[PDB]
Design a protein around this nucleic acid. Sequence first.
RNA 1: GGGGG
RNA 2: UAGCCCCC
Length: 1264
Amino acid sequence: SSMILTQFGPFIESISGITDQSNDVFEDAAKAFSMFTRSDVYKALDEIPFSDDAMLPIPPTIYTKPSHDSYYYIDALNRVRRKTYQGPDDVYVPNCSIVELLEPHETLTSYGRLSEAIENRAKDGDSQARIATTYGRIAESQARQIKAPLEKFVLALLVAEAGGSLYDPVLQKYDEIPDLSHNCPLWCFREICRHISGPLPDRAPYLYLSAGVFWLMSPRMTSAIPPLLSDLVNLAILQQTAGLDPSLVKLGVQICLHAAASSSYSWFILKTKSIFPQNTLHSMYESLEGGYCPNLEWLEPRSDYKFMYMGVMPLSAKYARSAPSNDKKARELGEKYGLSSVVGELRKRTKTYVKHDFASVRYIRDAMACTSGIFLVRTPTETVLQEYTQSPEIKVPIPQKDWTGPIGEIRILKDTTSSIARYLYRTWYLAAARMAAQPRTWDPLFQAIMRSQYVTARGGSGAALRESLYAINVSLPDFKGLPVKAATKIFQAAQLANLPFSHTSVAILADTSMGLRNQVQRRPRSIMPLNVPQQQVSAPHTLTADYINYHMNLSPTSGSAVIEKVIPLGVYASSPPNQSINIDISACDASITWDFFLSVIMAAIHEGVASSSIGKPFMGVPASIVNDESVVGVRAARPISGMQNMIQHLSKLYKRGFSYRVNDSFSPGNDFTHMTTTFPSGSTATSTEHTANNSTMMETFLTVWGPEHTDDPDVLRLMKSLTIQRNYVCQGDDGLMIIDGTTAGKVNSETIQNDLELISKYGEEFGWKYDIAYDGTAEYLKLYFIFGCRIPNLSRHPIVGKERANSSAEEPWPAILDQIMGVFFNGVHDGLQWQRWIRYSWALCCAFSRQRTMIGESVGYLQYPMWSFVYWGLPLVKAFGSDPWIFSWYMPTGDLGMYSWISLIRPLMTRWMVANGYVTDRCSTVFGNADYRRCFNELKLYQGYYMAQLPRNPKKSGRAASREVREQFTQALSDYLMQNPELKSRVLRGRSEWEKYGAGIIHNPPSLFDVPHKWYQGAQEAAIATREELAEMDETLMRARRHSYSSFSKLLEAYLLVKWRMCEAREPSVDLRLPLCAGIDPLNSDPFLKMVSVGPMLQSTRKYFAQTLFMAKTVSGLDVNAIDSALLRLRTLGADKKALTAQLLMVGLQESEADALAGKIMLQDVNTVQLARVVNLAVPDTWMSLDFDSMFKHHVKLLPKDGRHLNTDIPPRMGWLRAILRFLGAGMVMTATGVAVDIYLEDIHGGGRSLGQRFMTWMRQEGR
RNA sequence: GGGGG
RNA sequence: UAGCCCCC
Ligand SMILES: Nc1ccn([C@@H]2O[C@H](COP(=O)(O)OP(=O)(O)OP(=O)(O)O)C[C@H]2O)c(=O)n1
Ligand SMILES: Nc1ccn([C@@H]2O[C@H](COP(=O)(O)OP(=O)(O)OP(=O)(O)O)C[C@H]2O)c(=O)n1
Ligand SMILES: Nc1ccn([C@@H]2O[C@H](COP(=O)(O)OP(=O)(O)OP(=O)(O)O)C[C@H]2O)c(=O)n1
Ligand SMILES: [Mn+2]
Ligand SMILES: [Mn+2]
């Protein structure tokens, strides 16, 4: 460690709280990181005096592996395939030798790539050559699922840990996290690699590059080493930063060693991934003596997902695990995969926890951080053949006799059907009618928003559409000469803009291109990039599904994103007396087929939508005639609406199936079109659709089936007390059945077990295999809960991991920084040990802050000052002679955050600056007599500040665009959007109205007329950048670094005029013995103190924020937050109502709605959060898990502590100031380490009035 | 672009 | 060729 100490000495102390941070030391540390050679990191690793406890037997078979050749074969269709041995799952990358297939690299003679000879033979068509190429390309792919070379993360860890234990400012003692000599993962990493390199001078087992992966030419290297090493590094970092129990961590290493010792690392990982969760989380408290859990009340209406904390629920034996024991299956699993030693140890330790508390949840969390974090990989061919093959077993089909004769592509489900489909059909029919009945549905704007949803910069099987169209002699415009990417639905929209639906209808049946996605702890999933006409025609399906979800059930719309996964719901559901069943449906997409679901859904919508859609087109789709054969004998023609025409065309596609075009670039010669009946993922209907069926069937079970299939009084009573509107929350195929508890305790476990078994049997009737789980735990949207405590899963957030489905190279340097910041933010949300995490993050950041640049032998270097990271959100450890660790990771981002940390030490800074020569006679309002301008330019604080705000990726705008084709394109886009003259007429009105009442007040008027331009830009910025555009990006960053400044942004200079007084610590908002988030306990002072004093966010963040906008949606391309900001700004700038009415007309509203919302906005008392947007202030993401609403309202006093001040008084017409002022106070409170404190407005330099004018100038100048 | 179903 | 839905 002397190697590390010498090279990063001063920097190490700067990030350990011992010495101040300085850009000079930081940049040198950066240069040192870049000058360190890979092999040096290993040499550094050798310098570590590892303890015996950090060692464990390493399997010799991890090095000696068979040839890959017996693991593959050519199938009947000539595709290269993986040959199974351990089951139908054994389709991943096998653990084999690989050096025999490599050619030494010219220069790195010890490293090699796949023999060019072998690929050439493979390309010629040689079976053996193809097999070898496939293996080589997929093994390479497996090794690319990381963000950057492992050595960088390791070096970072060495540098960070060289600082020793950290002194907690709050607890006033050093932490007791074992040093690296006790880190088993690192030891293994060094040994495994050393053993591989053997006598070779090169210590790296492989090199992650841009030109591709290269393997160390050693007979001991295996295709399984990259994944193994990647798991070890994560575990190594986590043991030091999450303060994980070392003994547990070793268990995680053993599993990984076993995975590398097996015949397939990924496969083995997939089969054993439940070990830690099953033997801890799902086995906790078989016995229970005490502890406390939350006591929440679910407010009304439950749909708001709003809860209120009511105290603590004392625990006792009464609440011990009552759910069935998983011991047997868990042990069988361990025995089957050679891990019974691990399962047994976990089972034993889990039993020792008889109290539910911080210690016990941290144990679970720790255990669950040890699961491999690799993104499983297998060839595309394998994913497609495993996911689009299995078909649902409909044990009780809809009788053929129950369908009427056809009505085009659909058949009505006779109302005399005794089938359970009866209910599924009624729900979709009902919702279809109500949806189509809504007036908004027939508003040109609404239909523009819908037509604009799928017009995006992402793909849409562009090539297949062009050819399915060529098949009927219809050639689309090619716009020869435009600098935009052609494979975008945006390009598609422009091509189709001026063609009648009848000419593009065939495209609805065009093939579907391949799209893949790798996941952690899961298998790769195939994706279907539907084309514009396919997405268009899917509208009715999507809208009806949305209507069901918004009006008929209890569901959360989104994908996930911590807190957006409604944390509050899990706390409630998992807290005794309450209990929850974690319902999930396997093979969801493959279970939604025409045989039972789609034929019914298509029918119900087609019919229920009839009367209100009659005699009318929809979203560009015309009405038409179709053959009618409903009645027997009677055969006529039937007029249907455009909406019906859509269902008509969509039904034709759902019936036939999807032609998936598979071009497997990892498997030479594996080109085939696979037909499948599995439901599309890339469809706008997918998510909402599955959510709707989920609740609909659960409703039917609880209302009909269940009751009719049992006479058991308790079960009948239990089911009767459950409602899909009050007790069942779902999204897609995930479900959470919440059984509220009584004073008599919780509902009988045996009665619950009966209900579940019936649900299970119930789904077999229509092809659904319910994955039900009753284990005393709550699991929803990959969020884990036990006894009201959230258990972060560190396993799913691989520090070094990064999904990479395609072969394309990683984005140019700059890009990596956003990823590193994301790694930091995940740690904040996962609750790692704040100091250890912050210090490590500074090391990591520093190690990626420098890049070598080229301009033609013009070898320079791009360096980001430490200050850029602060701007991005990374808190300072110690600066300007301040105490160490005074800054919390809840410090805001950007200007708000800069304001916060600077205000907390304004005086320290001023004093430091003067005592170091930065003095002047001019007395600064913020920094007194400190020559701040000279200081900030020299320290690179201004530089870093501005560099952080520059594009971290090449720009394509400015590419020579031949004006004529450029106008044709944007015209096509315009016609697509402005199809309906009514809409256009609306915007033109807003326009001339704007010139009279709004023009001049603000300069950011959002307008539908901009969309075509924003769409063009999007298609542009989607294309591959050139090396020139790259240089241009660097030059920009480098010019900002050279330039010298005299101030911060106009908004930051304005906030700095405001001063506060931090006062009394707040009282606890929740009980301090209450486990809310594992890892967030008295051992993690700042996070814990913030959680306790500020309080947890007990409402859904989606619901909360939906109340901070006047309009929820708008045409894709415009920014809802932008529209909201313009309206409020106009109001704040004294604009007349007619001006807001004009703004609203320009974004598509009818004059009546426009005038109404405008008049409504004028007289409204706007909330803190919504109002703060007038100046671009947003609630920080890191704050989302806390009760920031309460902080703004009751703990940021705008009235000075000692009464009113002339400067602090808020002018009559400037009440909007209070919202901005609330954010600034909150900033300082949240940025200060420790307990949330009450803060009092102390001063505003030039007074409130002048502050307001200052903000009003910023407002009216945006976009000039 | 980032983090997540 | 590389989809859809969400927090900044
Ligand atoms: N990028 C993504 C990720 C997920 N999904 C959707 O999420 C839904 C279900 O999620 P999973 O549980 O992850 O998919 P399953 O096929 O059901 O996996 P298996 O039963 O193992 O869980 C269906 C799928 O289309 C999606 O459209 N796009
Ligand atoms: N002032 C410097 C010089 C080099 N590098 C880093 O070095 C790496 C590759 O170049 P080297 O071959 O390692 O640089 P050398 O200067 O030739 O090595 P040193 O003096 O020991 O010889 C990439 C580049 O960013 C750097 O960050 N800053
Ligand atoms: N913004 C960037 C990114 C990369 N390059 C050029 O790309 C070439 C090699 O790519 P890298 O592998 O990304 O650069 P290295 O210095 O070899 O190391 P890495 O980015 O970790 O620093 C050399 C470098 O000048 C550049 O000029 N400007
Ligand atoms: Mn599922
Ligand atoms: Mn699921």
